Scaffold this active site. Sequence first.
Site, PDB file in Angstrom:
ATOM      1  N   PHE A 146       0.876  -1.005  -0.119  1.00 20.69           N
ATOM      2  CA  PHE A 146       0.083  -0.114  -0.119  1.00 20.69           C
ATOM      3  C   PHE A 146       0.764   1.182   0.072  1.00 20.69           C
ATOM      4  O   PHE A 146       2.016   1.495   0.913  1.00 20.69           O
ATOM      5  CB  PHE A 146      -0.884  -0.123   1.260  1.00 20.69           C
ATOM      6  N   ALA A 147       0.601   2.250  -0.993  1.00 13.94           N
ATOM      7  CA  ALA A 147       1.368   3.400  -1.055  1.00 13.94           C
ATOM      8  C   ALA A 147       0.391   4.454  -1.092  1.00 13.94           C
ATOM      9  O   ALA A 147      -0.082   4.863  -2.261  1.00 13.94           O
ATOM     10  CB  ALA A 147       2.395   3.362  -2.293  1.00 13.94           C
ATOM     11  N   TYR A 191       3.504   8.268   1.387  1.00 17.54           N
ATOM     12  CA  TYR A 191       4.195   7.033   1.276  1.00 17.54           C
ATOM     13  C   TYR A 191       4.396   6.479  -0.088  1.00 17.54           C
ATOM     14  O   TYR A 191       5.138   5.502  -0.520  1.00 17.54           O
ATOM     15  CB  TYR A 191       3.439   5.818   2.015  1.00 17.54           C
ATOM     16  N   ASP A 231       7.361   1.138   3.332  1.00 15.35           N
ATOM     17  CA  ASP A 231       8.576   1.778   3.800  1.00 15.35           C
ATOM     18  C   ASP A 231       9.770   1.145   4.128  1.00 15.35           C
ATOM     19  O   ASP A 231      10.247   1.051   5.165  1.00 15.35           O
ATOM     20  CB  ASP A 231       8.068   2.876   5.195  1.00 15.35           C
ATOM     21  N   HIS A 266       8.316 -10.145  15.082  1.00 17.74           N
ATOM     22  CA  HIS A 266       8.817  -8.603  14.942  1.00 17.74           C
ATOM     23  C   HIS A 266      10.099  -8.363  15.598  1.00 17.74           C
ATOM     24  O   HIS A 266      10.737  -9.056  16.594  1.00 17.74           O
ATOM     25  CB  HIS A 266       7.724  -8.077  15.962  1.00 17.74           C
ATOM     26  N   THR A 296       3.486  -6.513  23.482  1.00 19.76           N
ATOM     27  CA  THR A 296       2.618  -5.391  23.485  1.00 19.76           C
ATOM     28  C   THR A 296       1.124  -5.833  22.664  1.00 19.76           C
ATOM     29  O   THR A 296       0.705  -5.222  21.860  1.00 19.76           O
ATOM     30  CB  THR A 296       2.923  -4.134  22.821  1.00 19.76           C
ATOM     31  N   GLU A 337      -2.083  -4.884  13.777  1.00 21.80           N
ATOM     32  CA  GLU A 337      -0.863  -5.775  14.144  1.00 21.80           C
ATOM     33  C   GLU A 337      -1.463  -6.430  15.434  1.00 21.80           C
ATOM     34  O   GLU A 337      -1.120  -7.523  15.642  1.00 21.80           O
ATOM     35  CB  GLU A 337       0.221  -4.996  14.504  1.00 21.80           C
ATOM     36  N   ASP A 357      14.766  -3.203  11.329  1.00 20.45           N
ATOM     37  CA  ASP A 357      15.107  -1.913  11.125  1.00 20.45           C
ATOM     38  C   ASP A 357      16.686  -1.616  11.719  1.00 20.45           C
ATOM     39  O   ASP A 357      16.679  -1.973  12.955  1.00 20.45           O
ATOM     40  CB  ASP A 357      14.150  -1.072  11.956  1.00 20.45           C
TER      41      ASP A 357
END
Lengths: 283, 290
Positions: free
Chosen positions: A58-59, A63, A150, A170, A182, A240, A263
């Site tokens: 998705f953009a 984004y 991203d 994750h 979380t 999520e 990341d």
Amino acid sequence: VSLPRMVYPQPKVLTPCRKDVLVVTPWLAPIVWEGTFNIDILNEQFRLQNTTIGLTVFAIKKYVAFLKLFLETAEKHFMVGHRVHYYVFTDQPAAVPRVTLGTGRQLSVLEVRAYKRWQDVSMRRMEMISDFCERRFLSEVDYLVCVDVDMEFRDHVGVEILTPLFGTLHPGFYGSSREAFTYERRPQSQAYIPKDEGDFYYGGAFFGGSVQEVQRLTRACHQAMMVDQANGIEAVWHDESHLNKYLLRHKPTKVLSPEYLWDQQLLGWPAVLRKLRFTAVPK
Amino acid sequence: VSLPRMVYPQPKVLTPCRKDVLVVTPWLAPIVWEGTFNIDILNEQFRLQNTTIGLTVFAIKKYVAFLKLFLETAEKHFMVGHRVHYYVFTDQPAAVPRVTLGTGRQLSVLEVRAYKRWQDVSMRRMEMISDFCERRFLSEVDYLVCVDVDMEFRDHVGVEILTPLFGTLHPGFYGSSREAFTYERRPQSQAYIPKDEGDFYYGGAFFGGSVQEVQRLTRACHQAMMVDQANGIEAVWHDESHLNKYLLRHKPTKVLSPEYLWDQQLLGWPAVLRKLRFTAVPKNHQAVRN
Ligand SMILES: O=Cc1ccc(-c2cn([C@@H]3O[C@H](COP(=O)(O)OP(=O)(O)O)[C@@H](O)[C@H]3O)c(=O)[nH]c2=O)s1
Ligand SMILES: O=Cc1ccc(-c2cn([C@@H]3O[C@H](COP(=O)(O)OP(=O)(O)O)[C@@H](O)[C@H]3O)c(=O)[nH]c2=O)s1
Ligand SMILES: CCCCCCCCO[C@@H]1O[C@H](CO)[C@H](O)[C@H](O)[C@H]1O[C@@H]1O[C@@H](C)[C@@H](O)[C@@H](O)[C@@H]1O
Ligand SMILES: CCCCCCCCO[C@@H]1O[C@H](CO)[C@H](O)[C@H](O)[C@H]1O[C@@H]1O[C@@H](C)[C@@H](O)[C@@H](O)[C@@H]1O
Ligand SMILES: [Mn+2]
Ligand SMILES: [Mn+2]
């Protein structure tokens, strides 16, 4: 399928390569890390099935800027040698960059509504994938891989990930105990998971499976989100959180290691990661 | 399928239980060892699908003597809690011993011909399984498990083995290099595998999978044996040689460790085996001369 003769190193039953990490879940799904698979064997298996992989991304709004690097690196690293169909969901079809594609790869631009609320953009991906599973995917691809935009590919992401249903560990939480995950903790939400349950914390930015299983997952998550909405509650980490409730109750048949969702700015390059395959771009 | 809330220890990503053995093949099939699976989770998954397992066993000529301990120990250890059909193929239906079965477990005995040569009794199992699949005798279960009869269940054998297609590491070769595997080495045989190929040496005494995959495997092995027969060749280890050629070219989706196919009298109980689940019983007295 029946493979031809192949020459490759013999697996050693008494000498595993990865001793530093868990490579199989308690429900006998492999956890995919570098060293656990021989891509030559898997490639021949999936080629003999004439496999088509759909990749959804998705953009929307700003984004769209990430699309060029996302697609150009996907051409270098994603399912190379296999039939790939990119599905780019965007509110700016005119802003989709002209990316040159390898043979056997194609791109479709799907026009979608941009929700004002960034949380709604992220959460409504579930509805859109679910709807398109029906409208298109079911008749077009064998597997779907659903990722954030991203991001860039930096190393191989191939057919080793393919299976009826996969989630991805994750990068923030792979070493965390379940109490610290979380997850959504309010019992008023459909995404609720109590403190004594949970296997892993899966990342919403990379999941997939067969079209049938992904249709089911995305439909389930969307419905759960709609119920929450009607009850005036929104799960702490949005889609999520619901993805995690779903994969707790419907165990994935493969789990990808954080090599697949990383990341490097925030988390570096730990020794347990031998490859950084799909990584965040600064946003 | 959707599971209910369950409470069990969290799997730890940075802390594998089994560090001494390979637990996944290079094609990402699990290798099933004790410690790799939580049977509570797997039992729930398979019960939610109402899974029925068929167990095929051949008891021809003197091998009917093995049935009593085979079936009694299966009752204690094989797929307990799940629907099980025993399909017992024999030339002596009246010699099948009385064995009391738990609820949801059913014995079906079918009379079959006794081949003269022991090699043929062993090899023709593939033709018989394939034929009885096609005739819808064996096809109305979800998974088929195909074993030798000269055996005893010694510990849990459950739904952790189920998958579209599985083979089992032969106890004599799990630690061996591929050149040491006793594959058929004659290029003229359909079962030929040269010295630079091979993943594992699978035992002919324990394989299985979905009905579709077992039908295909057994039909393929039978046709390959028929091609060899027409060419005047009999493979070195008979049906096991063809099974090995088949699983080299059609990779199994799970591989069972030797916990599932052992001979304690011959091989002892090495440290790498935390449980011995299915083990040979002495068979010298049941031999018949060709
Ligand atoms: O300024 C705050 C925003 C948070 C998300 C936004 C957004 C996300 N998305 C898509 O949703 C995915 C998830 O959002 P994210 O990458 O910002 O989220 P996380 O990386 O925290 O999971 C993105 O990768 C895009 O595919 C868009 O296409 N347009 C967007 O404006 S904008
Ligand atoms: O006198 C030599 C014999 C070798 C096999 C024989 C045989 C085997 N069988 C079946 O084939 C399977 C394989 O033969 P096996 O167990 O003797 O061979 P191994 O594969 O364990 O060496 C047995 O478990 C039985 O199911 C019979 O039912 N009756 C038999 O007379 S008789
Ligand atoms: C004990 C470890 C404490 C430290 C944990 C550090 C990473 C936190 O990560 C966030 O985790 C959230 C759930 O709790 C969401 O998944 C969020 O989207 C994610 O940030 C996304 O993914 C991240 C990896 C970054 O790329 C960030 O920019 C993204 O917005
Ligand atoms: C010395 C290291 C190589 C040999 C190591 C020890 C086991 C040898 O095993 C035989 O292997 C053959 C293939 O090469 C066939 O599978 C044969 O059926 C099997 O014997 C069967 O299984 C055995 C375990 C015994 O129960 C034997 O009585 C059976 O007839
Ligand atoms: Mn993102
Ligand atoms: Mn035997």
